[PDB]
Every structure is written in C-alpha cells, then in structure tokens.
Amino acid sequence: RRKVRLAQPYVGVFLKRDDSNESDVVESLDEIFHTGTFAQIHEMQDLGDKLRMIVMGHRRVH
Amino acid sequence: RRKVRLAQPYVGVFLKRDDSNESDVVESLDEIFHTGTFAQIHEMQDLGDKLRMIVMGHRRVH
DSSP: OOOTSSSOOEEEEEOOOOOOOOHHHHHOOOGEEEEEEEOOOOOOOOOOOOOOOOOOOOOEEE | TTTSSSSOEEEEEEEEEESSOHHHHHHOOSSEEEEEEEEEEEEEOOOOSSSOOOOOOOOHHH
C-alpha cells in the first residue's frame, strides 16, 4: 500500500538460501541471496487472499 | 512502459500523410499531419500481442 503513492511502482524479487526460516528472514538479511531481479508491478488482484502479487523476472542484478 | 511512471498518463495520436512509409516515420517528422488528438490511456490488455493499446480522440489540437 505504501508504494501505491510512490511514483515508481516496482517490486524486487530475491532468492533465499538453504534452510529457509521465516524468523531468520525477519532477523538476519543474510539468508536472501545477493542475486535479485527488479520488476514492475502489474496489478493487485487479492481474489482469495489479501496478497496475490505478480512478479516476473525483468531486470536481474547481483 | 516509460510513461507509466509519469504522473499524467496520456497519449497523442496524429494522422499520417498519404503514401505511408514506416521508415519515413522514424526518419522524417514532417510526414505526420500537424493536426492531432491527445487523450488518456485507459488500461493495458496485451492479451495476445505485446502491444494492444486503446486510443481515444478526446482533445483535438492543430
């Protein structure tokens, strides 16, 4: 919601490392790989759930 | 995609002169008619083709 007001609507996509742990993700940022991919946000649907975001691999980076 | 970030999304549609030439469109800007019409993009579909824009004639200008 905060990025709706932003002039540039985009989402970064990243890949987690081995031994996925939500607590670790919210605690240590080293779990996520340095490699990532920024992409533009298409549209919010939230048909069944409140988070049904769309992510595509557009601009890779490390 | 570059005008999505723009606060005001709009598009201008002009009229080409007789003897249309695709190369001349990018080579010469005088082929197109002075008269044009500016409007606002409604929404992207891109169902089958990557480019399927919807164009309206809203504000005519010369």
